[PDB]
């Protein structure tokens, strides 16, 4: 009947926190080169077996749009690019007037044989060289004709060292002691809210940081039904994030057997120009089985009417705005940067009641200003030989149209301008909390009296 407060140390209490998180990668050390952009020299090796620990009776809220982990990975990825770009060859001298001509007379020409003076090793001597340039990287200025690189009026440019690789490898994330990562095990997880089935982990799953646009690649998938996650579905301004239940297959090729020209532009500095194409000159593309794509859209309009009425007209259209990098399924494949016309996909109309694979034309750039970033642009060096990379589509990014004639019908086109939106596709299942091991409760236990 005598109540006394009593102290307990190591009690299961935690609080939501924004803290400094850490990297995690398999301790595979395949250096046997000098590559590796993401894992770097010493990202901490992963646990052999993760101790994903289920928590009985525990119900926790997740919100992927107000998540601090997304807004961290995004900045985490950014610093690595600059850190990998700094020691490389800066192409300040490639802004000379370029004299370019068309390649092909058997027209059935998007690429230029470009001659220009350059700097040699000796400061006084100059050189006339030729390189091949894709049309997007270059612009005409005023008889010859005379041209320049697209970047020279926006920003300086630096060339990625050839040694570095652009391949996303799965990267986990581990929390320091006193913190914890909470992981939602709900299959039907709404965009936001409380997840009834919760496990705790020291590190997240292997998140492949595939930077891509309009479509998520080599990601993590969704169980049961395809998942529609928005911050607000009914709000057009907030995007609509989609996670697939079945992965589809994509084969991407740059079908010309290109060649690399090492041009010395100073002591140590060396520019990697695009040499003569060998074999046919073919345009890059990607196929996706048309059959599989009709299947995948059905699961979508099915999860859609659960949020739009059993009957309404749901059609798909192509992108209608943005930069060239947002109008296209932009991605990187093997080290060349692809930008693909997606109109054959988002062309159908759905009434909600062989392979014959669709081919997508793709343009290619070597000058890139990624992350909607103005300032340091990059020269992706030409990749010697033909390119072919296989990527799954593990998701989508869509967006609805504004106010029409009473919503008669609803229309969906892609695009993902923020990049975090790609990270949310792999981070919806995680949340950060800080550990509070101190609990106070009233008991009849009293300490022995001092007197």
């Amino acid at each position: 009947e005598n109540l006394w407060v009593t102290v307990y140390y190591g009690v299961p209490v935690w609080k939501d926190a924004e803290t400094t998180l850490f990297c995690a990668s398999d301790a595979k050390a395949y250096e046997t080169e000098k590559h590796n952009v993401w894992a770097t020299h010493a990202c901490v090796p992963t646990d052999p077996n993760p101790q994903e620990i289920h928590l009985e009776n525990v119900t926790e809220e997740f919100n992927m749009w107000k998540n601090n982990m997304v807004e961290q990975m995004h900045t985490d990825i950014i610093s690595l690019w600059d850190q990998s770009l700094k020691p490389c060859v800066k192409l300040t001298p490639l802004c000379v007037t370029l004299q370019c001509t068309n390649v092909t007379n058997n027209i059935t020409g998007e690429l230029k044989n470009c001659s220009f003076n350059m700097t040699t090793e000796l400061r006084d001597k100059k050189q006339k060289v030729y390189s091949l340039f894709y049309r997007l990287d270059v612009v005409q200025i005023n008889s010859n004709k005379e041209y320049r690189l697209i970047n020279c009026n926006t920003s300086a440019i630096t060339q990625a060292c050839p040694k570095v690789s652009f391949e996303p490898i799965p990267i986990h994330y581990c929390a320091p002691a006193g913190f914890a990562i909470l992981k939602c095990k709900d299959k039907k997880f709404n965009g936001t809210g409380p997840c009834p089935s919760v496990s705790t982990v020291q590190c997240t799953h292997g998140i492949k940081p595939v930077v891509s646009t309009q479509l998520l690649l080599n990601g993590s998938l969704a169980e049961e039904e395809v998942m529609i996650r928005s911050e607000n579905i009914t709000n057009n301004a907030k995007n609509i994030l989609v996670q697939f239940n079945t992965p589809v297959q994509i084969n991407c090729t740059r079908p010309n057997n290109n060649t690399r020209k090492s041009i010395r532009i100073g002591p140590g500095q060396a520019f990697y120009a695009t040499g003569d194409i060998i074999g046919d000159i073919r345009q890059a593309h990607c196929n996706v089985s048309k059959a599989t794509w009709n299947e995948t859209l059905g699961k979508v309009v099915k999860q859609l009417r659960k949020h739009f009425g059993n009957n309404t007209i749901i059609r798909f259209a192509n992108s209608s705005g943005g930069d060239l990098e947002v109008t296209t399924h932009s991605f990187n494949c093997g080290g060349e940067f692809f930008y693909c016309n997606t109109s054959g996909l988002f062309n159908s109309t759905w009434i909600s009641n062989s392979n014959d694979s669709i081919t997508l034309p793709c343009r290619i750039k070597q000058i890139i200003n990624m992350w909607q970033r103005i300032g340091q642009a990059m020269y992706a060096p030409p990749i010697q030989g033909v390119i072919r990379c296989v990527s799954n589509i593990t998701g989508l990014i869509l967006t609805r149209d504004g106010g029409s004639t009473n919503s008669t019908t609803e229309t969906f086109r892609p695009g993902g301008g923020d990049m975090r939106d790609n990270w949310r596709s792999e981070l919806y299942k995680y949340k950060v909390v800080k550990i509070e091991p101190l609990g106070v409760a009233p008991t009849r236990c009293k300490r022995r009296v001092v007197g």
């Epitope: 911050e231 607000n232 009914t234 709000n235 057009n236 301004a237 907030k238 992108s319 209608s320 705005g321 943005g322 930069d323 947002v326 909607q372 967006t399 504004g402 106010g403 695009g415 993902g416 301008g417 923020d418």
Partner: antibody, heavy 123, light 98 residues
């Protein structure tokens, strides 16, 4: 600070195009969307579009797709819009705006408003 | 279909009763003075935007919003409007009989 200013009023005739600027200042233009609304002197306002500078992307009220084109110039913190196939039926007051100083990240609604550009279409 | 009253009688020192019915209605409430520059009065339905007068507040329903004013003035003689995301209600010319 935190304000919208639009190009000068115009009068154009049927078929013709029209481009209107909306110079923005006092906030970091890039982060927030930008919608455009049309008031006729004598009917409601008819939303048209939005365009984040970060990606430059859009979507237009189906009453309006195709005829319209919205453009930005982040070098200068400014947006634009161009309306083609002008008919007399589209003469109205055109205001640019955005939500910035709210505490509603849901993009809606709009509080910060250009004075407007009046466009008369009539032969 | 987004709708609201068209005209409302009023007078100084009084209170005015207006409506708006529609799905997700009463997202914000505006005031256009004859001429230019419409202006947001209350975001959401009951959110005094930081930087307006306090005698402003709003109520709503599952589909019907309602904006409320005390101590009317001739300064509030203008057209008043109901925002619904993409869609904008018809338009009430509030008259303050002075």
């Amino acid at each position: 600070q935190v304000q919208l200013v639009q190009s000068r009023a115009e009068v154009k005739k049927p078929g013709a195009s029209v481009k209107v600027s909306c110079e923005a200042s006092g906030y970091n233009f890039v982060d927030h969307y930008i919608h455009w609304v049309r008031q006729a002197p004598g009917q409601r306002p008819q939303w048209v579009g939005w365009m984040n500078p970060r990606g430059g992307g859009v979507n237009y009220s189906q009453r309006f797709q195709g005829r319209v084109t919205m453009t930005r110039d982040t070098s200068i913190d400014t947006a634009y819009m161009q309306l083609n196939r002008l008919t007399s039926g589209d003469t109205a007051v055109y205001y640019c705006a955005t939500q910035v100083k709210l505490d509603s990240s849901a993009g809606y609604p709009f509080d910060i408003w250009g004075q407007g550009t009046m466009v008369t279409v009539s032969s | 279909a987004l709708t609201q009253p068209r005209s409302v009688s009023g007078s100084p020192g009084q209170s005015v009763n207006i409506s708006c019915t529609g799905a997700y209605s009463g997202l914000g409430w505006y005031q256009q003075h004859p001429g230019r520059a419409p202006k947001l009065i209350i975001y959401e339905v009951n959110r005094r935007p930081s930087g307006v007068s306090d005698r402003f507040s709003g109520s709503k329903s599952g589909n019907t919003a309602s904006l409320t004013i005390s101590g009317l003035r001739t300064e509030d003689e203008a057209d008043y409007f109901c925002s619904a995301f993409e869609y904008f209600g018809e338009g009430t010319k509030l008259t303050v009989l002075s």
